[PDB]
PDB file of C-alpha atoms and ligand atoms in Angstrom:
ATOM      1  CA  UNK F   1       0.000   0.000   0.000  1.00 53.96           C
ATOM      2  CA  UNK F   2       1.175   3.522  -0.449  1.00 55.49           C
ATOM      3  CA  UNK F   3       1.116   6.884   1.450  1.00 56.94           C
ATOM      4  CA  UNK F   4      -1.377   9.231   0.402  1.00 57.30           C
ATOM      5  CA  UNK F   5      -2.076  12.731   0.752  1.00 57.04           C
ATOM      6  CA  UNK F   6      -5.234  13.538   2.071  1.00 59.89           C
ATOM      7  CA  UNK F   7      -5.320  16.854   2.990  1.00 61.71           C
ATOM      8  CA  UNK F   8      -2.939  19.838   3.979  1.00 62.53           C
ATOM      9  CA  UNK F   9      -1.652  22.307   6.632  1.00 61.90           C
ATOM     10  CA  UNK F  10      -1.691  25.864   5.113  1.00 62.88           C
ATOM     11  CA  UNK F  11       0.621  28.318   6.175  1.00 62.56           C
ATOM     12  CA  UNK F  12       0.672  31.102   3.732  1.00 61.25           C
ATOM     13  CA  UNK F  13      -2.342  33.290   5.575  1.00 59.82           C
ATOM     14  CA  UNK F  14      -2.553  34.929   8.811  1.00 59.18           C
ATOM     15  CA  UNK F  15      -3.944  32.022  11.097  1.00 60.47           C
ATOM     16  CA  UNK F  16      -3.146  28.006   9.796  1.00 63.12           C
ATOM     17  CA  UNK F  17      -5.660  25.978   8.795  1.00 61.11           C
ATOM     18  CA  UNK F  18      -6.432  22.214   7.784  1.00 64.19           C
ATOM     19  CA  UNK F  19      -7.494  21.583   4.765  1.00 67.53           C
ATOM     20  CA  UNK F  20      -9.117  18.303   3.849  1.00 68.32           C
ATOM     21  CA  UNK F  21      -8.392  16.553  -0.098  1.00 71.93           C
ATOM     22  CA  UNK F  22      -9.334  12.874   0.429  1.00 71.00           C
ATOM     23  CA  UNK F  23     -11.790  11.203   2.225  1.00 73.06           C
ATOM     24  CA  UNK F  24     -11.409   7.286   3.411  1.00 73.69           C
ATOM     25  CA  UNK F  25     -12.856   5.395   0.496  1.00 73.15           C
ATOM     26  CA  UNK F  26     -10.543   7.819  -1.629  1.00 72.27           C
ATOM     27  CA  UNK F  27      -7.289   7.296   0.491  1.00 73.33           C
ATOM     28  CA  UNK F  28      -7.911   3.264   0.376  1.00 76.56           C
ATOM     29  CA  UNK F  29      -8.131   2.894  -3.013  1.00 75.41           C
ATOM     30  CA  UNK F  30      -5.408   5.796  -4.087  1.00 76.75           C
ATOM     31  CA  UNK F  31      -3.497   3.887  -1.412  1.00 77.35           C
ATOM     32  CA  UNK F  32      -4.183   0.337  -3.275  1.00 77.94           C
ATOM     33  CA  UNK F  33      -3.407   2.050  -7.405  1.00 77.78           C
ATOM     34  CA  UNK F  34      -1.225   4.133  -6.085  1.00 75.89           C
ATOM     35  CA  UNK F  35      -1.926   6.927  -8.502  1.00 77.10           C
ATOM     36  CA  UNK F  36      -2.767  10.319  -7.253  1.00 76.61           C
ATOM     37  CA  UNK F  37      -4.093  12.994  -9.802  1.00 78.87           C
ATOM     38  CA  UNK F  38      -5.003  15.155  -7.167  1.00 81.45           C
ATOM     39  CA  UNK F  39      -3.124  19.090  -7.025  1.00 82.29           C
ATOM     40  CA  UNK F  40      -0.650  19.147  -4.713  1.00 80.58           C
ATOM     41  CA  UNK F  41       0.099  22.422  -2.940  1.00 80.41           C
ATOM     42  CA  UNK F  42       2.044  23.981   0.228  1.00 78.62           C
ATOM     43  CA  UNK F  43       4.793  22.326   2.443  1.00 79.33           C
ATOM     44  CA  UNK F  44       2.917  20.248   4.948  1.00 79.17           C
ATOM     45  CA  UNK F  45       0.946  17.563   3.946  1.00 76.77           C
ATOM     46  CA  UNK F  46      -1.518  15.261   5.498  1.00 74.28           C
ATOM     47  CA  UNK F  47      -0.610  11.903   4.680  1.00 73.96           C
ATOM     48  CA  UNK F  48      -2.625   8.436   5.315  1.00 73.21           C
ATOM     49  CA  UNK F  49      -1.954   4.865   5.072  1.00 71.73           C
ATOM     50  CA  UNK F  50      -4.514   2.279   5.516  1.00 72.14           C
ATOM     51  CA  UNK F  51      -4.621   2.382   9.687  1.00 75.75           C
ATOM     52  CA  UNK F  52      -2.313   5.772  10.226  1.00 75.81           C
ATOM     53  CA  UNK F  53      -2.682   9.461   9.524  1.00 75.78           C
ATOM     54  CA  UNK F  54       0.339  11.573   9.992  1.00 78.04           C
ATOM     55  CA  UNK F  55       1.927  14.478   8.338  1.00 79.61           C
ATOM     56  CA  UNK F  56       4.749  15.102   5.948  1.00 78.23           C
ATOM     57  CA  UNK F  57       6.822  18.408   5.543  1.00 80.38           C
ATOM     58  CA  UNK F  58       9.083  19.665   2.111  1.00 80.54           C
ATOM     59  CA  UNK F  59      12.266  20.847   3.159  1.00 81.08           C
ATOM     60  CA  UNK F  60      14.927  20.786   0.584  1.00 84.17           C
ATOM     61  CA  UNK F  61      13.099  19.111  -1.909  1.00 84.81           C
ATOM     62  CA  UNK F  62      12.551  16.578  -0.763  1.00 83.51           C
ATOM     63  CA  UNK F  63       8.916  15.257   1.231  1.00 83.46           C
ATOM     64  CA  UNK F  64       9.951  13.633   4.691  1.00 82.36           C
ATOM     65  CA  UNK F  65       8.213  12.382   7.610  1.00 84.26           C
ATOM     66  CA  UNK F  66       8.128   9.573  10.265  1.00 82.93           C
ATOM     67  CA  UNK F  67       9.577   5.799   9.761  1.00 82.86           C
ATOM     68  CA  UNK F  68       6.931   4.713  11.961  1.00 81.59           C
ATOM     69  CA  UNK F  69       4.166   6.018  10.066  1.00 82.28           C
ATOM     70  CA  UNK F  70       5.287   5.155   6.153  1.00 79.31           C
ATOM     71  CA  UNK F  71       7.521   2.171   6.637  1.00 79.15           C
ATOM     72  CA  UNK F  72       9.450   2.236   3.290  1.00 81.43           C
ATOM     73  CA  UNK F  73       5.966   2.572   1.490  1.00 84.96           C
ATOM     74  CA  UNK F  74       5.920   4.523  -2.322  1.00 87.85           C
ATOM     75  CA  UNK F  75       4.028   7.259  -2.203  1.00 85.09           C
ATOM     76  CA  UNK F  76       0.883   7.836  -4.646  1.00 83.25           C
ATOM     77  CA  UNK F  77       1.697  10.506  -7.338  1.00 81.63           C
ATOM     78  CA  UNK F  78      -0.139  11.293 -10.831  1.00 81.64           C
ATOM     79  CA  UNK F  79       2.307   8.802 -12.524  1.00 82.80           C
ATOM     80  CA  UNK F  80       2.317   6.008  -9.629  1.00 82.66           C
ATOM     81  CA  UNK F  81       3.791   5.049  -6.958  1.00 79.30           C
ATOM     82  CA  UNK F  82       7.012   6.803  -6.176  1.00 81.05           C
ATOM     83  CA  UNK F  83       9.498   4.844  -4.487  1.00 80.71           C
ATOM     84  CA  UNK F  84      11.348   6.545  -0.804  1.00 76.35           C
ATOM     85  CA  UNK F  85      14.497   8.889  -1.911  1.00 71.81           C
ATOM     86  CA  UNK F  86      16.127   8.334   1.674  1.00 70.37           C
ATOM     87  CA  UNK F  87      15.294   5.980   4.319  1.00 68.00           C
ATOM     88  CA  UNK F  88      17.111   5.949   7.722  1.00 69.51           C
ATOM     89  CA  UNK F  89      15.335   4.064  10.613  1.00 70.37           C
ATOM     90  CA  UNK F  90      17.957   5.179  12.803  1.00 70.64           C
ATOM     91  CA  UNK F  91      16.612   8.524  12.613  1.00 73.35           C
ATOM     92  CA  UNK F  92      13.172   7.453  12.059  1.00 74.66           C
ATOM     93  CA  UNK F  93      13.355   9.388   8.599  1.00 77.77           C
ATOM     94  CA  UNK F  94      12.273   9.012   5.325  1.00 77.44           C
ATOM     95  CA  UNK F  95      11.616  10.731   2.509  1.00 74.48           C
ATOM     96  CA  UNK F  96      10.439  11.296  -0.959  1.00 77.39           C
ATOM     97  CA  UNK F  97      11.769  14.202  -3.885  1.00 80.62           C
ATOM     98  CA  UNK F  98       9.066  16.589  -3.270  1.00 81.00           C
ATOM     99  CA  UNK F  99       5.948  16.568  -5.605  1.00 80.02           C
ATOM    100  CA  UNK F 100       5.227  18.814  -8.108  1.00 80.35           C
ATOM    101  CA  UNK F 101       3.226  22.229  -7.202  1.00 78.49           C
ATOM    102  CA  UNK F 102       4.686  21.466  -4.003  1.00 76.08           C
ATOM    103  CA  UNK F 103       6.616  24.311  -2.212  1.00 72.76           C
ATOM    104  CA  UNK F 104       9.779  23.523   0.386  1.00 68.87           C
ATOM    105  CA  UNK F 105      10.674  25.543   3.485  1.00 69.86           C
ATOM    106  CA  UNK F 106      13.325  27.095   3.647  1.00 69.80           C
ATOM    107  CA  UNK F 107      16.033  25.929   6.372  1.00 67.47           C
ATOM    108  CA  UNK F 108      16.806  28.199   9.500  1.00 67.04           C
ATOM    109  CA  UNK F 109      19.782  29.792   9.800  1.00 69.45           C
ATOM    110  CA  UNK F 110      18.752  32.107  12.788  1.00 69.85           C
ATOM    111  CA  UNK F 111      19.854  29.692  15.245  1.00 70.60           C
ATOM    112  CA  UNK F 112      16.656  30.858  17.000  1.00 72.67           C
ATOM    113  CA  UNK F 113      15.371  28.645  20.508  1.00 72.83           C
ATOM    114  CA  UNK F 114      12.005  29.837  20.304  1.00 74.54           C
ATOM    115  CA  UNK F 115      10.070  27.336  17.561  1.00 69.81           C
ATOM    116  CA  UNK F 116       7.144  26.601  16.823  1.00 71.20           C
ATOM    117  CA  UNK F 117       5.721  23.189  16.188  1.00 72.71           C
ATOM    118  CA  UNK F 118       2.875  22.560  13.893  1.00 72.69           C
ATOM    119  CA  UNK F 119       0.166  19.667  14.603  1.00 72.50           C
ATOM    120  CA  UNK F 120      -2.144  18.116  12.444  1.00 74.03           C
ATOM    121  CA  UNK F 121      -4.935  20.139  13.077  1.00 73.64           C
ATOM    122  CA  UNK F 122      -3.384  23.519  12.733  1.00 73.06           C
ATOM    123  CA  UNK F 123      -2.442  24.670  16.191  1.00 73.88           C
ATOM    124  CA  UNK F 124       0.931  26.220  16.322  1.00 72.45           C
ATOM    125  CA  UNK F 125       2.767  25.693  19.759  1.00 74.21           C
ATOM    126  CA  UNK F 126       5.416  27.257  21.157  1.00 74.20           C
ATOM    127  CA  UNK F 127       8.506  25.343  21.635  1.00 75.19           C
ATOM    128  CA  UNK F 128      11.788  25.657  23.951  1.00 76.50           C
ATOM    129  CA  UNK F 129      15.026  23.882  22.526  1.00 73.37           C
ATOM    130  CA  UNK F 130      16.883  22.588  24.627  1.00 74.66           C
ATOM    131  CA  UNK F 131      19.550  20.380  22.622  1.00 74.41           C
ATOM    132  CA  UNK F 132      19.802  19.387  18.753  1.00 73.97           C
ATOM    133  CA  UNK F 133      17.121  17.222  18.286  1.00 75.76           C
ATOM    134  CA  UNK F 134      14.871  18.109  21.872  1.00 75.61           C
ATOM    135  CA  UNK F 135      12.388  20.734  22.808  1.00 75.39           C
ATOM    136  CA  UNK F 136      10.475  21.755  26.388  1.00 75.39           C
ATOM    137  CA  UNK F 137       6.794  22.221  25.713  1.00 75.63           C
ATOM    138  CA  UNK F 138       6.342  25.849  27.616  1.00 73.46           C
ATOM    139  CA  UNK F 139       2.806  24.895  27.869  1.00 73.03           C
ATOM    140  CA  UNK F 140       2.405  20.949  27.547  1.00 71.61           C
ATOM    141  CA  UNK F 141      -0.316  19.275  26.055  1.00 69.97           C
ATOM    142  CA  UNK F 142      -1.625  15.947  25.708  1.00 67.83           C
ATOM    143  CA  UNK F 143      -0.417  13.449  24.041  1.00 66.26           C
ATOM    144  CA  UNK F 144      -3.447  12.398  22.468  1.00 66.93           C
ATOM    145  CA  UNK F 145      -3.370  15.904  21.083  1.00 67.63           C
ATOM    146  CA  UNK F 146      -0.436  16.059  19.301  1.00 70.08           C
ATOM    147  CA  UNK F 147      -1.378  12.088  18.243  1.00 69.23           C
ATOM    148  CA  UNK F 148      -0.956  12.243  13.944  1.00 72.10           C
ATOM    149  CA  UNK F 149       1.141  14.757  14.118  1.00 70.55           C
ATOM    150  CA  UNK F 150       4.576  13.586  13.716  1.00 72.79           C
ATOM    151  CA  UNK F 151       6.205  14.408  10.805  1.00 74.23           C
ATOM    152  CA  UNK F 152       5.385  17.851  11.044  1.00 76.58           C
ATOM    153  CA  UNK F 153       7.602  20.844  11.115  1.00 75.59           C
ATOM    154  CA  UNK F 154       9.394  22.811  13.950  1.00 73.69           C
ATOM    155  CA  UNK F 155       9.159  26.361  12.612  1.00 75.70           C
ATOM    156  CA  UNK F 156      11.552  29.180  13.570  1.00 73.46           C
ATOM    157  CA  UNK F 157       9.928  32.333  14.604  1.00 70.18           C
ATOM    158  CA  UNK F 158      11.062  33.366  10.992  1.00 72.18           C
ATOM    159  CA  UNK F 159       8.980  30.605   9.734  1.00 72.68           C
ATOM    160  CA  UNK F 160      12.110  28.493   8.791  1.00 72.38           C
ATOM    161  CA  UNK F 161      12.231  24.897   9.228  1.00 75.28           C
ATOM    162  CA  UNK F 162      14.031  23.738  12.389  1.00 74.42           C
ATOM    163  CA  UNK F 163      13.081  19.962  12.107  1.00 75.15           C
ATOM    164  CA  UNK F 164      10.229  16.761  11.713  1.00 75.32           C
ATOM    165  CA  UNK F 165       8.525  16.525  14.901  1.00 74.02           C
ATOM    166  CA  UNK F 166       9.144  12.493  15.660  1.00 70.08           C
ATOM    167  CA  UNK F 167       8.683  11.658  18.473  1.00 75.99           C
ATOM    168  CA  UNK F 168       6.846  12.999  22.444  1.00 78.28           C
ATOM    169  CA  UNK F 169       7.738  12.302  26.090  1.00 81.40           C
ATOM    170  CA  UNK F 170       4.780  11.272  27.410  1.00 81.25           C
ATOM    171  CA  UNK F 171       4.311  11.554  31.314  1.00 84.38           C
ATOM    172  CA  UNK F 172       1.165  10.245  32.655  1.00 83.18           C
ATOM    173  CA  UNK F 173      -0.348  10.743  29.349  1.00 84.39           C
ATOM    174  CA  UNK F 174       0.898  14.239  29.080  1.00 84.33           C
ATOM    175  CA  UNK F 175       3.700  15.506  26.385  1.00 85.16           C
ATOM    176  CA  UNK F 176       6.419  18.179  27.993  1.00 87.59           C
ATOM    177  CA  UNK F 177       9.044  17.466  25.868  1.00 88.00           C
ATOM    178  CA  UNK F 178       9.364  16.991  21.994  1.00 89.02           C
ATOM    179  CA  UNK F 179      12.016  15.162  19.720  1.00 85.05           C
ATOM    180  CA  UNK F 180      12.635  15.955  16.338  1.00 85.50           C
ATOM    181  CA  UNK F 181      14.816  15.529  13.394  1.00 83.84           C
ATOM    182  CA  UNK F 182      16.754  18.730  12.722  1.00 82.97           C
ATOM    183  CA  UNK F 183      16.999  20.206   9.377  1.00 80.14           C
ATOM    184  CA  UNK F 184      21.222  19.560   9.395  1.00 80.67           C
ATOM    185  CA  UNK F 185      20.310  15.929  10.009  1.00 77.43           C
ATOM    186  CA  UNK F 186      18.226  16.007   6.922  1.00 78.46           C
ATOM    187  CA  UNK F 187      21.379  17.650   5.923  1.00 78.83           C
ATOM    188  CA  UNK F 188      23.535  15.381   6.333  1.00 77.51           C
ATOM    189  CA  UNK F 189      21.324  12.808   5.281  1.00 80.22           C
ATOM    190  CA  UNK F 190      21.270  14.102   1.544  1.00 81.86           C
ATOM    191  CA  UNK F 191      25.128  14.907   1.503  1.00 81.88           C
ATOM    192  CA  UNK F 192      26.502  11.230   2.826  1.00 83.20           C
TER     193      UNK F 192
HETATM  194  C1  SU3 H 201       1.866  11.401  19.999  1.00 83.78           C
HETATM  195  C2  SU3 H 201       2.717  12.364  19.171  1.00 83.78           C
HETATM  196  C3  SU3 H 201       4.089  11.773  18.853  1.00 83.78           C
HETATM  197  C4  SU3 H 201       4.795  12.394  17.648  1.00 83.78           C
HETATM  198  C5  SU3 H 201       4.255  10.973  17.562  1.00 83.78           C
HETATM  199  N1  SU3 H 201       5.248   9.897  17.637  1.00 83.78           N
HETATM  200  C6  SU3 H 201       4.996   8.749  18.269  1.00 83.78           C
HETATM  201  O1  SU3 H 201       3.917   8.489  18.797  1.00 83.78           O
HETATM  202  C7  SU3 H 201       6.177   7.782  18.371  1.00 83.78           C
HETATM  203  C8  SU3 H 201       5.926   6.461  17.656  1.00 83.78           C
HETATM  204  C9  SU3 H 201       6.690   5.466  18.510  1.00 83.78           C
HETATM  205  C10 SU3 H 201       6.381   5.964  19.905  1.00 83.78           C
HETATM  206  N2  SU3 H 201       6.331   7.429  19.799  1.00 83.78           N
HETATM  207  C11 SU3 H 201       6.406   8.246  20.868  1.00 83.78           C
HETATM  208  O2  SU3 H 201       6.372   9.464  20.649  1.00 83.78           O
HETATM  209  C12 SU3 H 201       6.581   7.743  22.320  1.00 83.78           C
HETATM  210  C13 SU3 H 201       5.259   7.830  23.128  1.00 83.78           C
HETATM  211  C14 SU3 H 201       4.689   9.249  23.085  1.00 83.78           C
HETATM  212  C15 SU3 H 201       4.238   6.851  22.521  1.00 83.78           C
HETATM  213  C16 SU3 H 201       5.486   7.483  24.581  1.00 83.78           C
HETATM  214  N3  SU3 H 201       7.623   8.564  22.951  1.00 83.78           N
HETATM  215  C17 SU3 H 201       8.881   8.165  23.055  1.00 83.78           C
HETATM  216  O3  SU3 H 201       9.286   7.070  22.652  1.00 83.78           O
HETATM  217  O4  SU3 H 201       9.723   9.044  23.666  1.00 83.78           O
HETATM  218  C18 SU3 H 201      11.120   8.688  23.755  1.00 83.78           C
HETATM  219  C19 SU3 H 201      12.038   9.484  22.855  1.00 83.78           C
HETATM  220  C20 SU3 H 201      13.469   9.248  23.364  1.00 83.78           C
HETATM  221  C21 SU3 H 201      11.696  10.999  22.894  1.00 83.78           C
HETATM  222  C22 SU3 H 201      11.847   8.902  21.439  1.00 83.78           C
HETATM  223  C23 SU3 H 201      12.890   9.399  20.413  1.00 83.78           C
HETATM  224  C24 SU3 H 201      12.711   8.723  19.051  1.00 83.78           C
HETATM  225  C25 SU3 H 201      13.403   7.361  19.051  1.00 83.78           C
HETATM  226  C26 SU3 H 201      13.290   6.585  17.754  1.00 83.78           C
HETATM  227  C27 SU3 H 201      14.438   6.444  16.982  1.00 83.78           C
HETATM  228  C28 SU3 H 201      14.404   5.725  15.780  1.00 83.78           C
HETATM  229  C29 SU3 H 201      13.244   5.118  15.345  1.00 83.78           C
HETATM  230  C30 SU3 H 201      12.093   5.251  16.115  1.00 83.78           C
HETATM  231  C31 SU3 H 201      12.125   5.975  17.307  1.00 83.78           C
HETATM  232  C32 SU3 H 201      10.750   5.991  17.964  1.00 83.78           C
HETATM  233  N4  SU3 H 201       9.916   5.224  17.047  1.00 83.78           N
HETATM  234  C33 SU3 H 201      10.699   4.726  15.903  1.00 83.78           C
HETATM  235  C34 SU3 H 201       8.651   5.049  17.308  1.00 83.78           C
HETATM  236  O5  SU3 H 201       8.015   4.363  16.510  1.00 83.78           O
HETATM  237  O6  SU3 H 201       8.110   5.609  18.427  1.00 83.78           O
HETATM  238  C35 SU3 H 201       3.046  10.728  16.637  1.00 83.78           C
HETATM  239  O7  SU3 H 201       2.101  11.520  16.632  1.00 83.78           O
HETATM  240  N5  SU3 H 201       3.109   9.654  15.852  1.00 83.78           N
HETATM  241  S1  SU3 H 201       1.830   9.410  14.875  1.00 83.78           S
HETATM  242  O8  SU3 H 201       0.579   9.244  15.671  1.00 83.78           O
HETATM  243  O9  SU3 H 201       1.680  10.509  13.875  1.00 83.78           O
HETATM  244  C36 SU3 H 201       2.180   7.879  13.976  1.00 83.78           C
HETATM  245  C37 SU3 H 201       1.325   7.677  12.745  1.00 83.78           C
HETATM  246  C38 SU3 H 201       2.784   8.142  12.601  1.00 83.78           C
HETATM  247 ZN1   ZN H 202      15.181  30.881  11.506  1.00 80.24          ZN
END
């Protein structure tokens, strides 16, 4: 089965928003063909398999997200599948070469510790760094609400991209920390 974009985050306007492009019956059977006519648009994506929803961010390029949530699946394009461009389950990365009418971030250079992490439903919340690939959530939240959004982007306050969201620690059900894949990791990842 493939990934499949279902729907995306927009960030070009004043407040994001979700934006829904495929329902279930559509992401099954795009999932199954593996051929996606559908526009593509933006950096973050909403992406599906058959029993996961998760995101996917352009940086570079190149479409990443989470290991966990795409295995080494193809992803479903407008001339078939399209096979994974990088895969490291070390880093719990993968990644496609972007698709086309899709737009990339652009990677920070400010070197900023105030980001910004963006969940699947559009919420942008603030996040401390505290190390290369760690965060402090100033204000936690659950874990059930960040739940679908990993692979999703760590935004500088310049809205840069800092990293893929990957991973939470959960306390008693409750996230204060993020992990995430920094942009020089996906870096280093295209160089070597
Ligand atoms: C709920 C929002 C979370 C973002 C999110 N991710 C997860 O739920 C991932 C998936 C799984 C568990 N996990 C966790 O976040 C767990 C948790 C909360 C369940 C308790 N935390 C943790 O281990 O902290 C430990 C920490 C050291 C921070 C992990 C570092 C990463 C270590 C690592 C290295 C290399 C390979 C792999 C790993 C971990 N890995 C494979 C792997 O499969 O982890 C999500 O929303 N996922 S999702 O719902 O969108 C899913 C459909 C895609
Ligand atoms: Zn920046």
């Amino acid at each position: 089965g493939s990934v499949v974009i279902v729907g995306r985050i927009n960030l070009s306007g004043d407040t994001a928003y979700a934006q829904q492009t495929r329902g279930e019956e559509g992401c099954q059977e795009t999932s199954q063909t593996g051929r996606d006519k559908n526009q593509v648009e933006g950096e973050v994506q909403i992406v599906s398999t058959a029993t996961q929803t998760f995101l996917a961010t352009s940086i570079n390029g190149v479409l990443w997200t989470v290991y966990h949530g795409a295995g080494t699946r193809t992803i479903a394009s407008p001339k078939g599948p399209v096979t994974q461009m990088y895969t490291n389950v070390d880093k719990d990365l993968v990644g496609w070469q972007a698709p086309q009418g899709s737009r990339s971030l652009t990677p920070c250079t400010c070197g900023s510790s105030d980001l910004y992490l963006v969940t699947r439903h559009a919420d942008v919340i603030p996040v401390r760094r505290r190390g290369d690939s760690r965060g402090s959530l100033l204000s936690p939240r659950p874990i059930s609400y960040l739940k679908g959004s990993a692979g999703g982007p760590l935004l500088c306050p310049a809205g840069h991209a800092v990293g893929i969201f990957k991973a939470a620690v959960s306390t008693r059900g409750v996230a204060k920390a993020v992990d995430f894949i920094p942009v020089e990791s996906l870096e280093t990842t295209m160089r070597s």
